[PDB]
């Protein structure tokens, strides 16, 4: 039983995932020997992110704007009104 | 049982996950050895993150803006009326 | 049982997470040895984030801005009227 | 008399010139005004040089290496037995 | 009468030069007014260099290594027998 | 009469030069006003240089590494015998 990142045993779930990222290197699981080594053994990882990210943002005279929103909702005998990142003019 | 990051043993869940981020290296795991060693060994690893990340955000005049936002909710037998990042013009 | 970031064993169970950061390197466990060594071993890390993070931001005569917010709710049975990160102009 | 680099006025002269170099701009000379302005007047520059250089030099087992060199000599009436970047192997 | 670098006004000379650099921006000479201005004027200038030079000199049993070297020698009468960077291996 | 670097005014010379550097902006010069001015004037000059110059020199059982030698001699009427940066290996 490994899991990484995100589930290794469940009954019952339910999930929402977002990203907005910049990753080099993940995910080195299971280094595990059984058995004999004699003379030598070199291991190595080099990683390196985000070189000059440049960016900008600009908004003028605008209403609504959403950039990044996740909702998850569970309901067994209910009810719901829910709301997010919303925007109401009149 | 190993979980590295969010679950490793569950009956019942739920979860919302969100991420704005920058990362090298993760997840070096079950590096574990049974036996014999005789000479030599080596491990090595380097990480380098986020090189000059130039950003500008801007907002002249505006009604409604939302960057991030992440709501959850989970209810058995009830009435939910929630909200989050939400704007009222009038 | 080795659970590094959230939860490693629950019954039942429900959250919400939001990040925004930067790393290098994590999750370096399970370094567990059942046997002999006779002679060397080396183990070696470096990690390096952050690297002249410029950022500006700028907002003029706004009406509603939210830049993060998190709100996770669980009811058994009742009722709920909540609100983060909420703007009302008349 | 306007000389920018090396030799405006001489009656008799000898030179020797190298370059291992980057340049983005040189030679913004003779900005003289005889006259009249009235309301606006800009003038802008910009420059930018040796974005991210990466160079290697490996050299095992050798016998005679020369990179860079610059000899000049003038005699009017005489001997001279000179020598630069010069290796002898027996 | 204007010289940047090297020689303006001269009746007999001699001169070696050599450069392993790296510049943005030079030369901004000659800025004169002979006049009358009546409002406004701007002047600018910006200048980056440099940006990440990487660079690596490796040399592993040799014999005669020379990198930069410069040699200039005037006699008027007279025996001359000079040496530079010279390396005598036996 | 203005010479930035080296030499204005002269009878005879002799002169050997050299550069390992990094220089953003140089020479403004000669910036002089005759006549008048009413209402407004803006100078602006800005250099940056040298950005995380990473560099490494490696030598291993050399016999003879030169770097970096300049020499420049004059004689009128006599013998010269002159070295530098020289190695003898025997
Ligand atoms: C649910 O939310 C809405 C508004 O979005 C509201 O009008 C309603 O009364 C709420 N409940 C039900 C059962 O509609
Ligand atoms: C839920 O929230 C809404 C407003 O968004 C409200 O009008 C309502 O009365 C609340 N409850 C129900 C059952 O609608
Ligand atoms: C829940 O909140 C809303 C306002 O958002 C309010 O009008 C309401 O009375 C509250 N409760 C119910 C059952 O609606
Ligand atoms: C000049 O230099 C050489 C060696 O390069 C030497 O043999 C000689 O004697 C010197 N002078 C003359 C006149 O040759
Ligand atoms: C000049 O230098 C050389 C060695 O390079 C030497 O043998 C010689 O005697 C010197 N003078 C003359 C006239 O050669
Ligand atoms: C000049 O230097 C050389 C050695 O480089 C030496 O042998 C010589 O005697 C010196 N003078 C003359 C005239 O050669």
């Given at each position: 039983?490994?899991?990484?990142?995100?589930?290794?045993?469940?009954?019952?779930?339910?999930?929402?995932?977002?990203?907005?990222?910049?990753?080099?290197?993940?995910?080195?699981?299971?280094v595990?020997?059984?058995?004999?080594?004699?003379?030598?053994?070199?291991?190595?990882?080099?990683?390196?992110?985000?070189?000059?990210?440049?960016?900008?943002?600009?908004?003028?005279?605008?209403?609504?704007?959403?950039?990044?929103?996740?909702?998850?909702?569970?309901?067994?005998?209910?009810?719901?009104?829910?709301?997010?990142?919303?925007?109401?003019?009149?």
């Amino acid at each position: 039983g490994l899991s990484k990142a995100k589930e290794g045993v469940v009954a019952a779930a339910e999930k929402t995932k977002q990203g907005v990222a910049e990753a080099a290197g993940k995910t080195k699981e299971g280094v595990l020997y059984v058995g004999s080594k004699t003379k030598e053994g070199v291991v190595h990882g080099v990683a390196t992110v985000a070189e000059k990210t440049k960016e900008q943002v600009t908004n003028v005279g605008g209403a609504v704007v959403t950039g990044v929103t996740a909702v998850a909702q569970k309901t067994v005998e209910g009810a719901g009104s829910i709301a997010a990142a919303t925007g109401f003019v009149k």
